[PDB]
Structures are given as C-alpha cells and as structure tokens.
Amino acid sequence: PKIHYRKDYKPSGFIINQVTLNINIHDQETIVRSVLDMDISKHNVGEDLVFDGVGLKINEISINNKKLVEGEEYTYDNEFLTIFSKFVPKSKFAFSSEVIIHPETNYALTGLYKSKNIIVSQCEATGFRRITFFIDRPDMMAKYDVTVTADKEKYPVLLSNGDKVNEFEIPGGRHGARFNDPPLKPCYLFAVVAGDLKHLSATYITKYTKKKVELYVFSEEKYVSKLQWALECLKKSMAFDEDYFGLEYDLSRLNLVAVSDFNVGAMENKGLNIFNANSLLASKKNSIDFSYARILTVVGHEYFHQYTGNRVTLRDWFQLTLKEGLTVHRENLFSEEMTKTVTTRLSHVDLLRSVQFLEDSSPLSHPIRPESYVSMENFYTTTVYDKGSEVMRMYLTILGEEYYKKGFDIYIKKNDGNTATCEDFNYAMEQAYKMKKADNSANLNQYLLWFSQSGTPHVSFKYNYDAEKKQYSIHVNQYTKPDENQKEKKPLFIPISVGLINPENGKEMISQTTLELTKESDTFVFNNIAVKPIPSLFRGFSAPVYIEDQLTDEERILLLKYDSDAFVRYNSCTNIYMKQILMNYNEFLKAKNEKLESFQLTPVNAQFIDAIKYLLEDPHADAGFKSYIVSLPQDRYIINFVSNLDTDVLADTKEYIYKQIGDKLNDVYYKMFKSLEAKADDLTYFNDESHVDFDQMNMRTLRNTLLSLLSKAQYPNILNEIIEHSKSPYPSNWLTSLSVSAYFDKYFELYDKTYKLSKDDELLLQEWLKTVSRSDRKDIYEILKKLENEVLKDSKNPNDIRAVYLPFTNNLRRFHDISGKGYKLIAEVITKTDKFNPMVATQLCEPFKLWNKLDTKRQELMLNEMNTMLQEPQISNNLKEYLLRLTNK
Ligand SMILES: O=C(CNc1ccccc1)N[C@@H](C(=O)NO)c1ccc(-c2cc(F)c(F)c(F)c2)cc1
Ligand SMILES: [Mg+2]
Ligand SMILES: [Mg+2]
Ligand SMILES: [Mg+2]
Ligand SMILES: [Mg+2]
Ligand SMILES: [Mg+2]
Ligand SMILES: [Zn+2]
C-alpha cells in the first residue's frame, strides 16, 4: 500500500516529448500501439526506466526499434513496466509498445471503456496507464498524434484531441481518423470517443481576436433532441470568460459528448469534454427543472477548465484544488450571473455547510491540499472542490472585483502553458493585495494556512454599544478544533463582510465593509453610530466557517425581514430554526431516556411564524427564497451540532416543528399554492428549448415545497390538488405528485402512472427511480425490493444504482431503522458494486460518513457493517483505504 507524500515531489529523470498512438478498436479487443519520443532529463541519475501500465497485455515492446525480451531486459507485474537501466539509452530515444485492452468488459469506467454502444475514455487522474504505458503524472507534458480505427458502421464518428488532419478507409469495412494536437498537455487530458453519434453545432466568434470556433454537442441518436440547452450553455460560458476575465478560447473546435455510463459529472479533456448524460442532456418534456441549472453549471465548469486546469495545469496531484477549487469558483460566479437568483449562492452554501462540514468533522477530515494519498480516485472530495471554491472566493472578497481581476490575470499570464502549484496562485493574489493596500510590505503568507489546515473554523461574536459616545464594538474570536492533522490550530485570515442595520427603519448604517480578522481575537470599533445596530455578519457567506452570531431571535427576525443580504437573512432564519431544534430535541430525548408519561415541548416562536407569514405574503419577495424559509435545515447540517444524535428523536423533533408552523400557516400555504399556479406552470415556452426562466423554476420549487408541507399535514382535500398536479406537463410537478402522494392510498396508482411516463427516456426513468427511493413510505423496504427485481436488476450503470439507493439513505426514520437493516442493505450494495466499480462503491459509502456522530447503538450497527465490508477478501484498494480511514483504523 504505497503512500505518496506531498513533500516528496521530485521531477522525473525522463522526458516524454512526443506521443504517437494508433488505437485499433475490434469486436473482442482493442489494440493500442504507441511510440514515445523520449529523452533523459537533467535530474536523471541512471535509474531504471519505469512506466505505469495497469492491466495491459503486452504484444511487444521496443527501444529504438529493437524488440526487448521479458526477464533479461524488462519486467512487467501488471502495474509497472521496468526497463533495466543498462538497456536505457543515454540520449534521445524512441520507446514503442503494442498492448491489448478490453473496453467491452471495463465496467470500472476508467481508462478506455464501452458505454452502451460508445467507446469512450476517462483518464483523470491516473487512467491513461490503463490504455498504454506512460509516466502517468501531470508534469510529464507531451505532444500527441493520435490515430483511431474502427468498424465504420458501428463507429462512424471518431474523435480525439486536436485537429482532425486525416480520414481514411480501411479494407474490411473499417475506417480511421488521425488527430494532431501540437500544444503540450498532460496525459490525463487525453481523450478518444468512437460511436454512432449525432450532433448539434454552432459557430462562436471570439470577442477580441474574432476567431471562429466550431462548437459541437454529441449524443446517441435517440437523444439528439436533448442537446439544445447544452449548446446555449456553452455559448454563455464562452461569453462569461470573455466578459469577466477577458479570456478567449484558443482552439478551432470544442466538442461536448454525452455518455450514459460515467463515474462523475463531466471531464475537461482538451477540446473534447465528456459528460455524464445527466449533466448534458435535457428537454422540457423529459427532464426535471434541476437538470437546467445542472447542465449550465457543468458545461460552464468544464469550459472554465480550459484556462484553469488545461492551459495552466498541475505540477502534481496534491495541487488538485488549484484547478478544481478555482474552477468551481469560476463556475459559481458564472451561475450566479446567469440565473440572477439569490438562491444560486444560497444553494452552494447549503451544500457546503451540510455535506462538506460533515466531512470536515469526520475521521476523513483533510485540508484542501492534503499531505498524502494512497488512492487517487478517493482524492476527489467536497473538501477539495467546495471548500476549495470558498477559499478561492475569499480572495475576491478580500481584493474586490477590480484587484481580484488584476491578480487573476497575473496568474494566467505568468503560468499560461505551464504546470503550477497553489503557491503560484497565492503569489499572484499577493501582488494584487500589495497594490490594493498600497505597500509592498503587505503579504498573504498567513493565507496559505487555508490550504494546509483541516477542519472548520468557528467564529463567535460579542457586542457593545455606548449610546452617549455613538460608539459600537464587534468583538470577534476564531477557533478551530484540533484534529488528527494538526494538534495546534493557527488563526486564519478570515474576511468578514459586515453591515450594520438600523432596527428602527431597516437601513444600512455604514458603507460596504470587510473586516480582516487575522488574530485569534480582535475588537472592531465603529464611531458615529447613532443608535444600537443589529449586525449583519458574513454577508454572502464570506468565509467557510461556523457562524455563532450571539443574536436574540428578535434580532434575527428583524434581519430576516429587513436585512439587505440574502445569505444573512437565510442564515438568521437557519439560526432561529437550529435554536428551536436543539431545544425540542433535548426535550424529546429526556422524555425518551426518563420514560416520561407526560412532558412539555417548547413551542415555536410565534413572532418567527409571523415573520414567515409576512415574507410569504409579500408579492415582491423572491419565490426561491420563500422556499428556503419554510424548510428546516438539512439533517446533515443539524448533525454537526448534536453529539450521539438519535435519529428517531430528531425525526420527532422535525415533525413537531413542522406541525407547529403548519398549524398556523397551512391556509397561507394553500392560498399561495393556488395563486402561484398561473405563473409557475406557464406553458408559453414549453416547446422552446432555448428559453429557460430560473425565476419561474423557483416558483415551481415553492409550489412543490408547499404541496409537500400540505400533503404531510393531510390538509383537507389536498389529494384533489395532488391528482391534478399529476396531470401537469412538467416532470418536476408530476414527479412531485408521486412523492407527496406517499401519504395517501393513491400512491401506487401514481407510481404506475409516472412509471409509464418515465420508462422510455433513460434519464427520466432515473429521475423516477430517485423519486421512488425518496418517497416517505412505511413500506419503503418492500418498494426497494420491487425496484431491484423489476427495474434495476443487475445494471452496472452508476446512474441507475445511485438513483435507487442514495435518496433512500436520506430517509431519516427508515434508513436508520434501529434494526440496522438499512445499513445492512447499503453495505450489501456497496460490496456488490465494489466488484466492478470501486470508485462508485466508495460513493455509495456516503451515509456511513456520519457514523460516529449517531447514538451509541447506531454507531455500533454502522461500524459492524463497515467491519463486515472490510473483511471481504476481494475488497478493492479504493474501498479498503476509504473504510480504514473512516473507521479510524
Ligand atoms: O463531475 C464532477 C463533480 N464533482 C466531484 C465529483 C467527484 C468527487 C468530488 C467532486 N467533477 C469532475 C470535474 O472536476 N470535472 O471538471 C471530475 C471528478 C472526478 C473525476 C475522476 C474520474 C475518475 F474516473 C477517476 F478515476 C478519478 F480519479 C477522478 C473526473 C472529473
Ligand atoms: Mg487488461
Ligand atoms: Mg459577447
Ligand atoms: Mg457545481
Ligand atoms: Mg441503461
Ligand atoms: Mg483516524
Ligand atoms: Zn473540474
């Protein structure tokens, strides 16, 4: 079990200058011939030449056209090809090889594989070595000349990186295409695609050089009608990079390709971006609303990599957050600008503070630049991506837009065409910082701790107001809990975007202000503050921290109603809910523990309920924001605040709070559900795939949230509304009708109706599976067995498996059944999946990430299943390493 250490980075003793590939796809095998034009680097010390090569069948290998002989001159152990140094030339030489691989049976979806009838590659991070021999690491930059051949009837469309420079016929019904890609690239950005693909295309003219760029979007023929939105999103992405960052695409063509079988969302292979079909394809008749934001963000994300990852690439994999954190940040800026809805930023914060905060307080906790790894497939985490994105966003908060753009351009201009490290980016930001502060003594050395220190900081506040002096003080403290990565945690550079709200009229009392907290504690004083303010803290969620605002619920209500910042309003609401949840949770827990025959629960604050009503009834307030305020915080957010969390007690706590609020507001909810119908379900543009209205989609979100609240409440005759909702043309609506009908005897009638609506579109059927999996059904285990027998079967498609099982694992009452039967079920699925796709097997482990935060009985139950999976003799490297880390072995 080889551990790679960040501090051990050393350049290779070799250079690979040119790659010339011939990939010949046949019925039962694929033959890969490769010539590498190589050289000896200045770091060489006479070592053996060792290539990565995993699962390759060697036909021959040669150096300078002399066939090498196994045993005497090289050894191969299915992982490394070692050429003994006595046979390695001392000057420029050619290494060639012919190997056989088998994409048809490559169900792990790394390297070269078959997805339905498409041959497709996935090489990030270390998958190129499953295609041919290489020094498979991103600092080995080379030129590529790639020829693909295949049966012409089965595979008429051939694609790789670069320019297609030849197309030719081959005897026996075959054909070939040659692709030359002269710019240097790392091998993880290599890609090849072969299939019977159909496309949409357009021409984009760049903003400054006025270059014509051909844009192509590809899918299997059945789904070509679902490509239109992706093409629009690509045009939008190109314009945003031009408009915000001044960056234009440099190549003549950009291809996007959807495949059905994909481990993640999409991949930024140079000029040949490859997508999970669920993140590229949509139509209004066959997709839920969520698909439209997903395609926009994933198309944008892969496009933004062309600069932040492709043109400026990574020195080594420890720098992953340099391209992923920065590209997620660029993707989020883009998405916020395109949607023009406050819920876009709120949705990102919601994900961070539930999923990523849980990870950062789990045994898996790591900084955004870890110190070591064993599995590279396990290295791709919400910490590296989403905390990384918040760390890259804090630079923008600190610098402001003008100086951020200046620093970002310094980064691009200095590193374009080269590998880079996190320090290179911090250095570029620091030059901007010196400019903004007007002294070359300023530095961002402390900022680097955001890359090395794991765990979530806690920031807490105390206040003081002197009415006679008109002087206001904010006392701030920061603290990070020690963990396995640092025994002593250092103070970070924390930017705190702040406003001060006048509680009498709701107005801003100071200009835009970002406090720079760089010590364990500091006191920030404001003069000429005419009345005691309510502070608006961490506007926009300006640092990835636990905020302890120390405000009363009365103060939080005033911010919720009258503050200018969407996040602080949403967070104030969140904090009111959390105070209520923790109180009622403890009251329910004590009654359970003490076996009480009677007890009292503290009711929900009536003025809070009044404020929710006030906002809901405001016709000028945002429908998406409204949907957030009527929803309790996510379970995975709540769990960060409770030790030994009893999931039944939490389910009872949530049920009480929702019933308390609904008992007061259900008539408001119903009136709104009806009044929103006309605008929410407007069909004017239903047959225009280019017309996407994020505000309208947010009104549907609000309607479907309200319908869920009313159905759980058994609001009088709400089943009539449910049935009518099932007839809506919009899948978001008619799939909602299935889930909310769970509380009625019509559930299985709607189950069958929506199945019939879904079964003939692959992606819609997966959305149907998720809806079933998520259904609040007491017979959910029996239902899951029915899905297994009738729909899922032995599919190896990750989208199918994830759709059936992951939503169910969020069922607080049923997945965490005290028998442990839910833990048993998902562990059986993980073990079964691990036989053919270890990466996806580790994704299915997600519900176990909180195991040591549950009550002691459920801890034991989860740990038992995890130890059972660890005892499987055939466990993958991925799954073993993951579960060993997660269980603190
Ligand atoms: O789709 C997404 C969504 N985010 C996300 C996914 C997973 C974890 C954390 C964040 N993220 C992609 C990206 O960043 N695209 O730009 C991405 C992610 C992973 C690999 C990859 C694939 C493999 F098959 C591997 F074996 C491997 F090691 C890595 C490729 C692309
Ligand atoms: Mg093999
Ligand atoms: Mg323009
Ligand atoms: Mg995203
Ligand atoms: Mg299928
Ligand atoms: Mg540990
Ligand atoms: Zn990415």
Coordinates of N, CA, C and O in Angstrom, one line a residue, residues 95-221:
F95 N 10.7 4.8 -27.5 CA 10.2 3.6 -26.8 C 8.9 3.3 -27.6 O 8.0 4.2 -27.8
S96 N 8.7 2.0 -28.0 CA 7.4 1.7 -28.6 C 6.8 0.4 -27.9 O 7.5 -0.4 -27.3
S97 N 5.5 0.3 -28.0 CA 4.8 -0.9 -27.5 C 3.5 -1.1 -28.2 O 2.9 -0.2 -28.8
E98 N 3.1 -2.4 -28.2 CA 1.8 -2.8 -28.6 C 1.2 -3.6 -27.5 O 1.8 -4.6 -27.1
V99 N 0.0 -3.2 -27.1 CA -0.7 -3.8 -26.0 C -2.2 -4.1 -26.4 O -2.6 -3.4 -27.4
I100 N -2.8 -5.0 -25.7 CA -4.2 -5.3 -25.9 C -5.0 -4.9 -24.7 O -4.6 -5.3 -23.6
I101 N -6.1 -4.2 -24.8 CA -7.0 -3.9 -23.8 C -8.4 -4.3 -24.2 O -8.7 -4.7 -25.3
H102 N -9.4 -4.2 -23.3 CA -10.7 -4.8 -23.4 C -11.8 -3.9 -22.9 O -12.4 -4.1 -21.9
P103 N -12.1 -2.8 -23.7 CA -13.1 -1.8 -23.2 C -14.5 -2.4 -23.0 O -15.2 -1.9 -22.1
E104 N -14.8 -3.5 -23.7 CA -16.2 -4.0 -23.5 C -16.5 -4.5 -22.1 O -17.6 -4.3 -21.6
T105 N -15.5 -5.0 -21.4 CA -15.7 -5.6 -20.1 C -15.1 -4.6 -19.0 O -15.0 -5.0 -17.8
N106 N -14.7 -3.4 -19.4 CA -14.2 -2.4 -18.4 C -15.3 -1.7 -17.7 O -15.7 -0.6 -18.1
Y107 N -15.9 -2.4 -16.7 CA -17.0 -1.8 -16.0 C -16.7 -0.8 -15.0 O -17.6 -0.2 -14.4
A108 N -15.4 -0.6 -14.7 CA -15.0 0.4 -13.7 C -14.9 1.8 -14.3 O -14.8 2.8 -13.6
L109 N -15.1 1.9 -15.6 CA -15.3 3.2 -16.3 C -14.1 4.1 -16.2 O -14.2 5.4 -16.1
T110 N -12.9 3.5 -16.1 CA -11.6 4.3 -16.1 C -10.7 3.7 -17.2 O -10.7 2.5 -17.4
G111 N -9.9 4.5 -17.8 CA -9.2 4.0 -19.0 C -10.1 4.1 -20.2 O -10.9 5.0 -20.4
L112 N -10.0 3.1 -21.1 CA -10.9 3.0 -22.3 C -12.0 2.0 -22.0 O -11.8 0.9 -21.6
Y113 N -13.2 2.5 -22.2 CA -14.4 1.6 -21.9 C -15.5 1.8 -22.8 O -15.5 2.7 -23.7
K114 N -16.5 0.9 -22.8 CA -17.7 1.0 -23.6 C -18.8 1.4 -22.7 O -19.1 0.8 -21.7
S115 N -19.5 2.4 -23.1 CA -20.8 2.8 -22.5 C -21.9 2.7 -23.5 O -21.9 3.4 -24.5
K116 N -22.7 1.6 -23.3 CA -23.7 1.3 -24.3 C -23.0 1.0 -25.6 O -22.2 0.0 -25.7
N117 N -23.2 1.7 -26.7 CA -22.5 1.5 -28.0 C -21.5 2.5 -28.3 O -21.1 2.7 -29.4
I118 N -21.0 3.3 -27.3 CA -20.0 4.3 -27.4 C -18.7 3.8 -26.7 O -18.7 3.4 -25.6
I119 N -17.6 3.9 -27.5 CA -16.3 3.7 -26.9 C -15.8 5.1 -26.4 O -15.8 6.0 -27.1
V120 N -15.3 5.1 -25.1 CA -15.0 6.4 -24.5 C -13.9 6.2 -23.5 O -13.8 5.2 -22.9
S121 N -13.1 7.3 -23.3 CA -12.0 7.2 -22.3 C -12.3 8.1 -21.1 O -13.1 9.1 -21.2
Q122 N -11.7 7.7 -20.0 CA -11.7 8.6 -18.8 C -10.3 8.4 -18.2 O -10.0 7.4 -17.6
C123 N -9.4 9.4 -18.3 CA -8.0 9.3 -17.9 C -7.7 10.0 -16.6 O -6.7 9.6 -15.9
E124 N -8.4 11.1 -16.2 CA -8.1 11.7 -14.9 C -8.5 10.7 -13.8 O -9.6 10.0 -13.9
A125 N -7.7 10.5 -12.8 CA -6.4 11.1 -12.6 C -5.3 10.3 -13.2 O -4.4 10.8 -13.9
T126 N -5.3 9.0 -13.0 CA -4.2 8.0 -13.4 C -4.8 6.9 -14.2 O -4.5 5.7 -14.0
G127 N -5.7 7.2 -15.1 CA -6.3 6.3 -16.0 C -5.6 6.1 -17.4 O -5.9 5.1 -18.1
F128 N -4.8 7.0 -17.8 CA -4.1 6.9 -19.1 C -3.3 5.6 -19.1 O -3.2 4.9 -20.1
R129 N -2.7 5.2 -17.9 CA -1.9 4.0 -17.8 C -2.7 2.7 -18.0 O -2.1 1.6 -18.1
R130 N -4.0 2.8 -18.0 CA -4.8 1.6 -18.4 C -5.1 1.5 -19.9 O -5.7 0.6 -20.3
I131 N -4.5 2.5 -20.6 CA -4.6 2.5 -22.1 C -3.3 2.1 -22.7 O -3.2 1.3 -23.6
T132 N -2.2 2.6 -22.2 CA -0.9 2.3 -22.7 C 0.2 2.7 -21.6 O -0.2 3.3 -20.6
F133 N 1.4 2.3 -21.9 CA 2.5 2.6 -20.9 C 2.8 4.1 -20.9 O 2.8 4.7 -22.0
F134 N 3.0 4.7 -19.8 CA 3.3 6.1 -19.7 C 4.0 6.4 -18.3 O 3.8 5.6 -17.4
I135 N 4.6 7.5 -18.2 CA 5.0 8.1 -16.9 C 3.8 8.9 -16.5 O 3.7 10.1 -16.8
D136 N 2.8 8.3 -15.9 CA 1.4 8.8 -15.8 C 1.3 9.8 -14.6 O 0.9 9.4 -13.5
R137 N 1.7 11.0 -14.8 CA 1.7 12.1 -13.8 C 1.7 13.4 -14.6 O 2.2 13.5 -15.7
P138 N 1.0 14.4 -14.0 CA 0.7 15.6 -14.9 C 1.8 16.5 -15.2 O 1.6 17.4 -16.1
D139 N 3.0 16.3 -14.6 CA 4.1 17.2 -15.1 C 4.9 16.6 -16.3 O 5.9 17.2 -16.7
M140 N 4.4 15.5 -16.8 CA 5.0 14.9 -18.0 C 4.3 15.3 -19.2 O 3.4 14.6 -19.8
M141 N 4.6 16.6 -19.7 CA 3.9 17.2 -20.8 C 4.4 16.8 -22.1 O 5.6 16.9 -22.3
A142 N 3.5 16.5 -23.1 CA 3.9 16.0 -24.3 C 3.0 16.4 -25.5 O 1.9 16.9 -25.2
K143 N 3.5 16.3 -26.7 CA 2.7 16.5 -27.9 C 2.0 15.1 -28.3 O 2.6 14.1 -28.0
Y144 N 0.8 15.2 -28.9 CA 0.1 14.0 -29.2 C -0.4 13.9 -30.6 O -0.9 14.9 -31.1
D145 N -0.2 12.8 -31.2 CA -0.6 12.5 -32.6 C -1.3 11.2 -32.5 O -0.7 10.1 -32.2
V146 N -2.6 11.2 -32.7 CA -3.5 10.0 -32.4 C -4.3 9.6 -33.6 O -5.0 10.4 -34.1
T147 N -4.2 8.3 -33.9 CA -5.0 7.7 -35.0 C -5.9 6.6 -34.3 O -5.4 5.8 -33.6
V148 N -7.2 6.7 -34.7 CA -8.2 5.8 -34.2 C -8.7 5.1 -35.4 O -9.1 5.7 -36.4
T149 N -8.9 3.7 -35.3 CA -9.5 3.0 -36.4 C -10.6 2.1 -35.8 O -10.5 1.7 -34.6
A150 N -11.7 1.8 -36.6 CA -12.8 1.0 -36.1 C -13.7 0.6 -37.2 O -13.6 1.1 -38.3
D151 N -14.6 -0.3 -36.9 CA -15.7 -0.6 -37.9 C -16.5 0.6 -38.2 O -16.9 1.4 -37.3
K152 N -16.7 0.9 -39.5 CA -17.3 2.2 -39.9 C -18.8 2.2 -39.5 O -19.3 3.2 -39.2
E153 N -19.5 1.1 -39.7 CA -20.9 1.0 -39.4 C -21.2 1.2 -38.0 O -22.2 1.9 -37.6
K154 N -20.4 0.6 -37.1 CA -20.7 0.7 -35.7 C -20.2 2.0 -35.1 O -20.8 2.6 -34.2
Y155 N -19.1 2.5 -35.6 CA -18.4 3.7 -35.1 C -18.0 4.7 -36.2 O -16.9 5.0 -36.5
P156 N -19.1 5.4 -36.8 CA -18.8 6.3 -37.8 C -18.2 7.6 -37.4 O -17.5 8.3 -38.2
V157 N -18.3 8.0 -36.1 CA -17.8 9.2 -35.6 C -16.6 8.9 -34.7 O -16.7 8.2 -33.7
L158 N -15.4 9.4 -35.0 CA -14.2 9.2 -34.3 C -13.7 10.6 -33.8 O -13.7 11.5 -34.6
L159 N -13.3 10.7 -32.6 CA -12.9 12.0 -32.0 C -11.7 11.8 -31.1 O -11.7 10.8 -30.3
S160 N -10.7 12.7 -31.2 CA -9.7 12.8 -30.1 C -9.4 14.3 -30.0 O -10.0 15.2 -30.5
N161 N -8.3 14.6 -29.2 CA -7.9 16.0 -29.0 C -7.2 16.5 -30.3 O -6.6 15.8 -31.0
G162 N -7.3 17.8 -30.5 CA -6.6 18.5 -31.5 C -7.4 18.6 -32.8 O -8.6 18.5 -32.9
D163 N -6.6 18.8 -33.9 CA -7.2 18.9 -35.2 C -7.3 17.6 -35.9 O -6.3 16.8 -36.0
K164 N -8.5 17.3 -36.5 CA -8.6 16.1 -37.4 C -7.9 16.4 -38.7 O -8.3 17.2 -39.5
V165 N -6.7 15.7 -38.9 CA -5.9 16.0 -40.1 C -6.0 15.0 -41.2 O -5.5 15.2 -42.3
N166 N -6.6 13.8 -40.9 CA -6.8 12.8 -42.0 C -8.0 11.9 -41.6 O -8.3 11.7 -40.4
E167 N -8.7 11.5 -42.6 CA -9.8 10.5 -42.6 C -9.5 9.5 -43.7 O -9.3 10.0 -44.8
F168 N -9.6 8.2 -43.4 CA -9.3 7.3 -44.5 C -10.1 6.0 -44.3 O -10.6 5.6 -43.3
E169 N -10.2 5.3 -45.5 CA -10.9 4.0 -45.5 C -9.9 2.9 -45.3 O -8.7 3.0 -45.6
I170 N -10.4 1.8 -44.7 CA -9.6 0.6 -44.4 C -10.3 -0.6 -44.9 O -11.5 -0.7 -44.7
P171 N -9.6 -1.6 -45.5 CA -10.3 -2.8 -46.0 C -11.0 -3.5 -44.9 O -10.6 -3.4 -43.7
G172 N -12.1 -4.2 -45.2 CA -12.9 -4.9 -44.3 C -13.9 -4.1 -43.6 O -14.4 -4.5 -42.5
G173 N -14.4 -3.0 -44.2 CA -15.4 -2.2 -43.5 C -15.0 -1.3 -42.4 O -15.8 -0.9 -41.6
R174 N -13.7 -1.0 -42.4 CA -13.2 -0.2 -41.3 C -12.8 1.2 -41.8 O -12.9 1.5 -43.0
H175 N -12.5 2.1 -40.9 CA -12.1 3.5 -41.3 C -11.2 4.0 -40.2 O -11.2 3.5 -39.1
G176 N -10.5 5.1 -40.5 CA -9.6 5.7 -39.5 C -9.7 7.2 -39.5 O -10.2 7.8 -40.5
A177 N -9.3 7.8 -38.4 CA -9.1 9.3 -38.4 C -7.9 9.6 -37.6 O -7.6 8.9 -36.6
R178 N -7.1 10.6 -38.1 CA -5.9 11.0 -37.4 C -6.1 12.4 -36.8 O -6.5 13.3 -37.5
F179 N -5.7 12.6 -35.6 CA -5.8 13.8 -34.8 C -4.4 14.3 -34.3 O -3.8 13.6 -33.5
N180 N -4.0 15.5 -34.7 CA -2.7 16.0 -34.3 C -3.0 17.2 -33.3 O -3.8 18.1 -33.6
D181 N -2.4 17.1 -32.1 CA -2.6 18.1 -31.1 C -1.2 18.6 -30.6 O -0.6 18.1 -29.7
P182 N -0.7 19.7 -31.3 CA 0.7 20.1 -31.1 C 0.9 20.7 -29.7 O 2.0 20.5 -29.2
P183 N 0.0 21.5 -29.1 CA 0.3 22.0 -27.8 C 0.5 21.0 -26.7 O -0.1 19.9 -26.7
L184 N 1.5 21.2 -25.9 CA 1.9 20.3 -24.8 C 0.7 20.1 -23.9 O 0.0 21.0 -23.5
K185 N 0.5 18.8 -23.4 CA -0.6 18.6 -22.4 C -0.2 17.4 -21.6 O 0.6 16.5 -22.0
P186 N -0.7 17.4 -20.3 CA -0.6 16.1 -19.5 C -1.5 15.1 -20.0 O -2.5 15.3 -20.6
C187 N -1.1 13.8 -19.7 CA -1.8 12.7 -20.3 C -3.2 12.5 -19.7 O -4.1 11.9 -20.3
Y188 N -3.5 13.1 -18.5 CA -4.9 12.9 -18.0 C -5.9 13.7 -18.9 O -7.1 13.4 -18.7
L189 N -5.5 14.6 -19.7 CA -6.4 15.3 -20.6 C -6.5 14.7 -22.0 O -7.3 15.2 -22.8
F190 N -5.8 13.6 -22.3 CA -6.1 12.8 -23.5 C -7.5 12.3 -23.4 O -8.0 11.8 -22.4
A191 N -8.2 12.2 -24.6 CA -9.4 11.5 -24.7 C -9.6 11.0 -26.1 O -9.1 11.5 -27.1
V192 N -10.4 10.0 -26.2 CA -10.9 9.4 -27.5 C -12.3 9.0 -27.3 O -12.7 8.5 -26.3
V193 N -13.1 9.1 -28.4 CA -14.5 8.8 -28.4 C -14.8 8.1 -29.8 O -14.3 8.7 -30.8
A194 N -15.5 7.0 -29.8 CA -15.9 6.4 -31.1 C -17.4 6.0 -30.9 O -17.7 5.3 -30.0
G195 N -18.2 6.3 -31.9 CA -19.6 5.8 -31.8 C -20.4 6.4 -32.9 O -20.0 7.1 -33.8
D196 N -21.7 5.9 -32.9 CA -22.7 6.4 -33.9 C -23.4 7.6 -33.3 O -24.6 7.6 -33.0
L197 N -22.6 8.7 -33.3 CA -23.1 9.9 -32.6 C -23.8 10.9 -33.5 O -23.4 11.0 -34.7
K198 N -24.8 11.5 -33.0 CA -25.5 12.6 -33.7 C -25.2 13.9 -33.0 O -24.8 13.9 -31.8
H199 N -25.4 15.1 -33.7 CA -24.9 16.3 -33.1 C -25.8 17.5 -33.4 O -26.6 17.5 -34.3
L200 N -25.6 18.6 -32.6 CA -25.9 19.9 -33.0 C -24.6 20.7 -33.0 O -23.7 20.4 -32.3
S201 N -24.6 21.8 -33.8 CA -23.4 22.6 -33.9 C -23.7 24.0 -34.1 O -24.8 24.4 -34.5
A202 N -22.7 24.9 -33.8 CA -22.9 26.3 -34.0 C -21.5 26.9 -34.1 O -20.5 26.3 -33.9
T203 N -21.4 28.2 -34.6 CA -20.2 28.9 -34.7 C -20.1 30.0 -33.7 O -21.1 30.8 -33.7
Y204 N -19.1 30.1 -33.0 CA -18.9 31.2 -32.0 C -17.7 32.1 -32.4 O -16.6 31.5 -32.8
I205 N -17.9 33.4 -32.4 CA -16.8 34.3 -32.8 C -16.3 35.0 -31.6 O -17.0 35.6 -30.8
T206 N -15.0 34.8 -31.3 CA -14.5 35.3 -30.1 C -14.5 36.9 -30.0 O -14.5 37.5 -31.1
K207 N -14.4 37.4 -28.8 CA -14.7 38.8 -28.6 C -13.6 39.7 -29.1 O -13.9 40.8 -29.6
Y208 N -12.3 39.3 -29.0 CA -11.2 40.2 -29.4 C -10.4 39.8 -30.6 O -10.2 40.6 -31.5
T209 N -10.0 38.5 -30.7 CA -9.3 38.1 -31.9 C -10.2 37.8 -33.0 O -9.8 37.6 -34.1
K210 N -11.5 37.7 -32.7 CA -12.6 37.4 -33.7 C -12.3 36.1 -34.4 O -12.5 35.9 -35.6
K211 N -11.8 35.1 -33.7 CA -11.6 33.8 -34.2 C -13.0 33.0 -34.3 O -13.8 33.1 -33.3
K212 N -13.2 32.3 -35.3 CA -14.3 31.4 -35.5 C -14.0 30.1 -34.8 O -13.0 29.4 -35.1
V213 N -14.9 29.7 -33.8 CA -14.7 28.4 -33.1 C -16.0 27.6 -33.4 O -17.1 28.1 -33.2
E214 N -15.7 26.4 -33.9 CA -16.8 25.5 -34.1 C -17.2 24.7 -32.8 O -16.3 24.1 -32.2
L215 N -18.5 24.8 -32.5 CA -19.0 24.1 -31.3 C -19.8 22.9 -31.7 O -20.8 23.1 -32.5
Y216 N -19.5 21.8 -31.1 CA -20.3 20.6 -31.4 C -20.7 19.9 -30.1 O -19.9 19.7 -29.2
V217 N -22.0 19.5 -30.1 CA -22.5 18.7 -29.0 C -23.1 17.4 -29.5 O -23.8 17.4 -30.5
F218 N -22.6 16.3 -28.9 CA -22.9 15.0 -29.4 C -23.7 14.1 -28.4 O -23.5 14.2 -27.2
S219 N -24.6 13.3 -28.9 CA -25.2 12.2 -28.1 C -25.5 11.0 -29.0 O -25.4 11.1 -30.2
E220 N -26.0 9.9 -28.4 CA -26.6 8.9 -29.2 C -27.8 9.4 -29.9 O -28.5 10.4 -29.5
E221 N -28.2 8.8 -31.0 CA -29.2 9.3 -31.9 C -30.5 9.4 -31.2 O -31.3 10.4 -31.5

